[PDB]
């Protein structure tokens, strides 16, 4: 879209007008372009060839028959008294055409040695070359046919084709539309090398043609944003005429195919000056040419034979019969130049950049003209580019330029396209660059790029040229001085940053959670925000599940994955499947990223004027229109949790491993969490815990549902955990332990409870009854023998009692144990074992 291809010979030619003898190596030219801000995507040298590669004329053709595809035994005149008999398989040439012949002993790019061959029962004393085989172009369906008069038979092929040239592929930034031509790039090189520039669009290079009257009746609606519209006829062109080889070659090297002299000239001048041109068959124009907007539902068939559905924002060129062109994009087939066109009306117009951009994007037409208008075309060279086209076409097509000219320049007519002047201090570029440039550096560089600078003491008044609409503010001028003086002269000094506060508590906690999970055996992945197709249908989630309320992307890379992630599990499970499916069956993955949980339908906020600061209410409105995006931590486990070794066969992943992942995240966050049984898909309802911080729910953990595992292709027993880190408050505890020097008392209590009673509820009841003497409690036995009873279990806890100021007796600890026993009997219905 921003590509600009041009040969170095053409680029050197324009620079050399004002700098005779200027010539640089392609390596130095590449560095200079990069140093001033022009990215060189590729440097493609033509050829090279060696040996007998000459121009020939096909004098006779013999159609060798009897084979699958037609073969031609050709007699080629290479400029001597002995015609060479060459076999060829191409069919895009006739007797009398000029071709490029590689004779035996020649070398073609790359390393292809040419010699006499015995093909199709004949003797091939050479080879007729194609554009691709000569490294001149990409055409390979046929051989290269030079236009008549390009060269005589026997001329050096490398010289006629200009294989010593070098093609430069540039990527022009959208702020330098003036560089999408040989004119602008030559001006840039003239600035970089401090040379005198002769503008190829000036009146000296393009002397104006006569203006004796109107060329065609024109009605322009100014609401379409057109700044200029010029018309000049060229009558009496020869339909049999063809563009000379020097013109077709420069078009080919610039990436444009030659068709007819009328169109070839318009493309050539567009590449030379930067003003897109179009040739209309004047004999097919019916009445007054009108420039207006397209009406609703109006259609137009462009010159490629495709019907275009137009919009009311599209600028059209119409007559009394039909639409003549899509303003600034592509002409129509009605007034298109054909093989029998004798009278041509040339169009030179300056369209609105924004209107052309919207039209060419809606119709998917990034033409050579469109991608130049949307980057602003110099409105001052329209007649210059027009006269350049007329005089060139009349010379090569044997036509005659009409002395008539229509030049609509607005209402009222604009005779000066100068942008508004800019006031800037003379030392402003010095301050931004941190360099003390020599005296007059800012004024000299701004005058090189075509601006007029006047001095008012210490303040400069700069008026940029018409081809530089990117220069509106003093900062735009600063870039011009800094880039032409070279950014390498800017020194390296460290800024005076104030004392900072470092990482926030949330940023610090995110590191600690990542370290703890990694040191515990989990492998971090980068979760993709795009959800897999129908993953919630695989999970069996209800239609009203909050996780289904997703945010969808209009243009995703995969159309079946438009929704954004409300949970981190689908990305982890997809990464889990990748590892397991590739031989890594024992894996524990984790991720820390945000989710997208909207609270309403996608509602946007209008454009706030950027000329001021948005008010605090407008900032709060922009935040309320965005979906909630909290930080989540999640993990998935499958296979062996502990690997096998000399200790034993290892331990497969169980739900407790996911529960332990919760306590690892909790300890890393320095918060206390509680786990409670919950039924929450996609987890196993009997092996799923809901994690709470105090009384706020922060996530779930456990083993996944066996049905979800089957439908998702997951390993059996797969476990998962997901927590909302934003729902976990950042804690900064300040403990003050009192280490008691007195001995402890060790006792064990065995309590029998119902099977559904959580072991933590019993421990919490024991602590609540034991009091402050209880220093530690730990479960170490869960017995479900037949002497316990059906649906009942026995729990044995190790108790450690210690007083802070005395030595306890066994009765003192037993009194605390008995009080703990009564508390368990009252809260969880525990019965003392016995």
Partner RNA sequence: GGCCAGGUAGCUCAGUCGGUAUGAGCGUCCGCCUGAAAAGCGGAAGGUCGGCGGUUCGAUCCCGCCCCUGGCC
Feature table: binding site for Mg(2+): 470, 476, 479-480
Distance CA 346, CA 266 (A): 8
> Using the rule CB under 8 A, is 685 a contact of another protein?
yes
> Using the rule CB under 5 A, is 812 a contact of Mg ion?
no
> Using the rule CB under 8 A, is 227 a contact of another protein?
no
Indicate the residue among 279 and 365 with the shorter CB distance to RNA: 365
Distance CA 208, CA 380 (A): 13
SS3 25: coil
From 241, 707, 798, 815, residue interacting with another protein (rule: CB under 8 A):
707
Indicate the residue among 81 and 603 with the shorter CB distance to another protein: 603
SS3 269: helix
690 in Cβ contact with 629 (< 8 Å): no
Indicate the residue among 268 and 683 with the shorter CB distance to another protein: 683
CB-side neighbour CA atoms (13 Å) of 351: 34
Identify the CA nearest to 157 among candidates 94, 106, 96, 85. 106
Q: With CB cut-offs between 5 and 8 Å by kind, which of another protein, RNA, Mg ion, none does residue 354 bind?
A: another protein
List Cβ neighbours of 2 (8 Å cut-off, separation of 6 or more). 171, 172, 173, 174, 371
Distance CA 265, CA 147 (A): 15
**Options 133-141, 392-400, 401-409, 477-485: segment touching Mg ion (CB under 5 A):** 477-485
**Long-range own/partner contacts, residues 820-824 (CB < 8 A, 24 or more apart):** 820/749, 820/765, 820/766, 820/767, 820/768, 820/769, 820/770, 820/774, 821/749, 821/751, 821/766, 821/769, 822/769, 823/765, 823/766, 823/768, 823/769, 823/770, 824/751, 824/753, 824/762, 824/765, 824/766, 824/769
Phi, psi dihedrals of residue 663, rounded to the nearest 5° = -70, -25
Q: With CB cut-offs between 5 and 8 Å by kind, which of another protein, RNA, Mg ion, none does residue 410 bind?
A: none
719 in Cβ contact with 653 (< 8 Å): yes
Residue 777 beta carbon to another protein: minimum distance, rounded to whole angstroms: 16
Q: With CB cut-offs between 5 and 8 Å by kind, which of Mg ion, another protein, RNA, none does residue 452 bind?
A: none
Indicate the residue among 139 and 660 with the shorter CB distance to RNA: 139
Indicate the residue among 533 and 624 with the shorter CB distance to Mg ion: 533
Q: With CB cut-offs between 5 and 8 Å by kind, which of RNA, Mg ion, another protein, none does residue 560 bind?
A: RNA
Residue 552 beta carbon to another protein: minimum distance, rounded to whole angstroms: 4
**Long-range own/partner contacts, residues 295-301 (CB < 8 A, 24 or more apart):** 298/323, 300/326, 300/332, 301/332, 301/333, 301/334
Q: With CB cut-offs between 5 and 8 Å by kind, which of Mg ion, another protein, RNA, none does residue 833 bind?
A: none
Q: With CB cut-offs between 5 and 8 Å by kind, which of RNA, another protein, Mg ion, none does residue 706 bind?
A: another protein
Residue 352 beta carbon to another protein: minimum distance, rounded to whole angstroms: 9
Distance CA 400, CA 412 (A): 32
Identify the CA nearest to 365 among candidates 410, 306, 290, 426. 306
From 108, 535, 591, 689, residue interacting with another protein (rule: CB under 8 A):
689
- Taking residues 498 to 517 in sequence order and writing x for each that binds another protein by CB under 8 A, - otherwise, the string is x-x-----------------
> Using the rule CB under 8 A, is 607 a contact of another protein?
yes
Distance CA 359, CA 311 (A): 8
Q: With CB cut-offs between 5 and 8 Å by kind, which of another protein, RNA, Mg ion, none does residue 582 bind?
A: RNA
Number of residues that bind another protein (CB under 8 A): 56
Indicate the residue among 126 and 464 with the shorter CB distance to Mg ion: 464
With vertex at residue 593, the alpha carbon angle to CA 589 and CA 599, rounded to the nearest 5 degrees, is 130
Residue 207 burial class via C-beta count within 10 angstroms: exposed 0-12, middle 13-18, buried 19 and up: exposed
Contacts with RNA, residue ranges (CB under 7 A) = 138, 364, 556-560, 581-583
Indicate the residue among 82 and 555 with the shorter CB distance to RNA: 555
Q: With CB cut-offs between 5 and 8 Å by kind, which of another protein, Mg ion, RNA, none does residue 583 bind?
A: RNA
Site for another protein in 169-188 (CB under 8 A): 174-175
Site for another protein in 734-763 (CB under 8 A): 758-759
577 in Cβ contact with 535 (< 8 Å): no
**Options 200-208, 414-422, 509-517, 549-557: segment touching another protein (CB under 8 A):** 549-557
Indicate the residue among 479 and 660 with the shorter CB distance to Mg ion: 479
Residue 815 backbone class (left: φ over 0; alpha: ψ -120 to 50; beta: rest)? alpha
Residue 676 beta carbon to another protein: minimum distance, rounded to whole angstroms: 7
Residue 149 backbone class (left: φ over 0; alpha: ψ -120 to 50; beta: rest)? left
Give just the sign of the alpha carbon dihedral 358, 359, 364, 365: negative
From 30, 298, 343, 479, residue interacting with Mg ion (rule: CB under 5 A):
479
Helix axes 441-448, 182-192, angle to 10 degrees: 160
> Using the rule CB under 8 A, is 630 a contact of another protein?
no
Q: With CB cut-offs between 5 and 8 Å by kind, which of Mg ion, another protein, RNA, none does residue 621 bind?
A: none
Q: With CB cut-offs between 5 and 8 Å by kind, which of another protein, Mg ion, RNA, none does residue 558 bind?
A: RNA
Distance CA 268, CA 274 (A): 10
Q: With CB cut-offs between 5 and 8 Å by kind, which of another protein, Mg ion, RNA, none does residue 689 bind?
A: another protein
625 in Cβ contact with 608 (< 8 Å): no
* H or E stretch covering 590: strand 587-594
Distance CA 475, CA 420 (A): 15
Distance CA 471, CA 513 (A): 50
Residue 557 beta carbon to another protein: minimum distance, rounded to whole angstroms: 9
Indicate the residue among 156 and 479 with the shorter CB distance to Mg ion: 479
- Provide the Cα torsion 241, 242, 247, 253; round to 10°: 160
> Using the rule CB under 8 A, is 374 a contact of another protein?
yes
Indicate the residue among 178 and 530 with the shorter CB distance to Mg ion: 178
**Options 371-379, 396-404, 479-487, 720-728: segment touching Mg ion (CB under 5 A):** 479-487
Residue 32 beta carbon to another protein: minimum distance, rounded to whole angstroms: 24
**Options 255-263, 380-388, 414-422, 494-502: segment touching another protein (CB under 8 A):** 494-502
Indicate the residue among 487 and 503 with the shorter CB distance to another protein: 503
**Options 103-111, 243-251, 356-364, 580-588: segment touching another protein (CB under 8 A):** 356-364
Residue 206 beta carbon to Mg ion: minimum distance, rounded to whole angstroms: 28
From 457, 613, 647, 811, residue interacting with another protein (rule: CB under 8 A):
613
CB-side neighbour CA atoms (13 Å) of 380: 16
Distance CA 401, CA 689 (A): 88
59 in Cβ contact with 84 (< 8 Å): no
> What are the C-alpha distances in Å from 84 to residues 5, 76, 159, 363?
37, 5, 21, 51
Residue 364 beta carbon to RNA: minimum distance, rounded to whole angstroms: 6
- Taking residues 514 to 543 in sequence order and writing x for each that binds another protein by CB under 8 A, - otherwise, the string is ---------------x--------------
> Using the rule CB under 8 A, is 38 a contact of another protein?
no
Q: With CB cut-offs between 5 and 8 Å by kind, which of RNA, Mg ion, another protein, none does residue 479 bind?
A: Mg ion
Q: What is the CA radius of gyration of the chain?
A: 41
Indicate the residue among 559 and 739 with the shorter CB distance to RNA: 559
Binding site residues, another protein, CB under 8 A: 1-2, 174-175, 353-355, 357-358, 361, 371, 374-375, 495, 497-498, 500, 529, 551-556, 562, 602-607, 610, 613-614, 619, 625-626, 655, 659, 675-677, 679, 684-689, 702, 705-707, 758-759, 782
Binding site residues, Mg ion, CB under 5 A: 479
């Amino acid at each position: 879209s921003n590509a600009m291809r041009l040969p170095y010979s053409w680029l050197r030619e324009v620079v050399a007008v004002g700098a005779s003898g200027w010539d640089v190596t392609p390596g130095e030219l590449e560095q200079t372009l990069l140093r001033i801000g022009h990215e060189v995507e590729e440097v493609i040298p033509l050829g090279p060839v060696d040996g007998p590669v000459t121009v020939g004329r096909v004098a006779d053709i013999e159609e060798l028959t009897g084979y699958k595809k037609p073969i031609r035994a050709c007699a080629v005149d290479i400029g001597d008294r002995q015609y060479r008999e060459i076999i060829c398989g191409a069919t895009n040439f006739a007797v009398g055409d000029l071709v490029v012949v590689a004779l035996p002993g020649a070398t073609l790019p790359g390393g292809f040695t040419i010699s006499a061959r015995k093909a199709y029962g004949r003797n091939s004393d050479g080879m007729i070359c194609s554009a691709a085989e000569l490294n001149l172009g990409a055409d390979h369906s046929g051989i290269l046919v030079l236009p008549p008069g390009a060269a005589e038979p026997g001329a050096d092929g490398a010289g006629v084709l200009g294989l010593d040239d070098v093609v430069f592929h540039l990527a022009i930034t959208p702020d330098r539309g003036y560089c999408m031509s040989v004119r602008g790039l030559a001006r840039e090189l003239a600035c970089a090398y401090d040379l005198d520039f002769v503008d190829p669009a000036s009146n000296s290079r393009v002397p104006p043609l006569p203006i004796e009257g109107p060329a065609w009746p024109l009605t322009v609606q100014p609401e379409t944003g057109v700044r200029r519209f010029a018309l000049r006829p060229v009558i009496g062109i020869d339909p049999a005429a063809v563009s000379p080889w020097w013109l077709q070659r420069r078009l080919l090297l610039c990436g444009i195919r030659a068709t007819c002299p009328a169109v070839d000239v318009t493309n050539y001048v567009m590449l030379e000056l930067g003003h897109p041109m179009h040739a209309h068959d004047r004999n097919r124009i019916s009445g007054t040419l009108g420039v207006r907007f397209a009406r609703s539902g109006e259609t137009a068939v462009t010159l490629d034979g495709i019907e275009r559905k137009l919009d009311t924002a599209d600028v059209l060129i119409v007559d009394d019969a039909a639409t003549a062109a899509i303003g600034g994009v592509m002409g129509a087939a009605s007034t298109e130049v054909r093989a029998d066109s004798t009278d041509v009306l040339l169009e030179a117009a300056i369209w609105d950049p924004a209107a052309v951009s919207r039209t060419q994007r809606r119709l998917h037409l990034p033409s050579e003209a469109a991608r130049r208008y949307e980057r602003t075309v110099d409105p001052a060279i329209s007649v210059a580019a027009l006269d350049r086209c007329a005089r060139l076409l009349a010379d090569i097509a044997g036509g005659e330029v009409s002395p008539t000219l229509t030049d609509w320049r607005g209402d009222p007519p604009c005779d000066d396209w100068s942008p508004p002047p800019i006031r800037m201090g003379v030392d402003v570029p010095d301050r931004i660059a941190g360099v003390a440039y020599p005296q007059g550096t800012t004024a000299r560089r701004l005058a090189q790029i075509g601006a007029v600078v006047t001095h008012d003491g210490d303040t400069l008044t700069v008026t940029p040229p018409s081809w530089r609409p990117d220069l509106r503010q003093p900062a735009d001028l600063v870039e011009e001085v800094l880039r032409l003086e070279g950014l390498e002269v800017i020194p390296s000094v460290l800024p005076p940053a104030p004392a900072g506060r470092g990482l926030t508590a949330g940023q610090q906690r995110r590191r600690t959670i990542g370290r703890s999970l990694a040191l515990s055996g989990y492998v971090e992945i980068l979760p993709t925000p795009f959800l897999p197709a129908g993953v919630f249908d695989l999970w069996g989630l209800e239609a009203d599940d909050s996780r289904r309320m997703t945010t969808r992307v209009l243009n995703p890379l995969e159309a079946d994955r438009p929704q954004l992630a409300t949970t981190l599990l689908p990305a982890l499970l997809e990464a889990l499947v990748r590892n397991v499916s590739r031989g890594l069956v024992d894996v524990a993955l984790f991720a820390i990223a945000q989710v997208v949980q909207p609270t309403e339908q996608t509602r946007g906020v209008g454009l706030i004027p950027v000329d001021r600061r948005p008010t605090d209410d407008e900032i709060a409105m922009l935040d309320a229109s965005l979906p909630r995006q909290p930080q989540h931590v999640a993990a998935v486990l499958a296979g062996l949790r502990e690997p096998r070794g000399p200790w034993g066969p290892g331990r497969p992943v169980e739900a407790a491993d996911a529960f332990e992942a919760v306590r690892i995240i909790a300890r890393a966050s320095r918060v206390d969490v509680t786990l409670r049984p919950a039924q929450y898909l996609p987890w196993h309802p009997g092996r799923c815990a809901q994690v709470f911080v105090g009384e706020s729910s922060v996530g779930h953990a456990g083993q996944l549902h066996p049905a979800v595992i089957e439908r998702s292709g997951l390993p059996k027993g797969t476990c998962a955990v997901e927590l909302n880190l934003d729902a976990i408050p950042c804690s900064a505890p300040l403990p003050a332990p009192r280490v008691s020097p007195y001995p402890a008392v060790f006792q064990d209590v065995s309590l029998v409870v119902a099977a559904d009673i959580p072991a933590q509820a019993v421990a919490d009841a024991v602590r609540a009854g034991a009091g402050d003497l209880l220093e530690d409690i730990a479960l170490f036995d869960v017995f479900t023998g037949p002497q316990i009873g059906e649906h009942r279990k026995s729990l044995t806890f190790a108790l450690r009692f210690r007083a802070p100021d005395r030595t306890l007796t066994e009765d003192d600890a037993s009194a605390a144990r008995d009080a703990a026993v009564q508390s368990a009997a009252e809260r969880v219905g525990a019965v003392l074992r016995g």
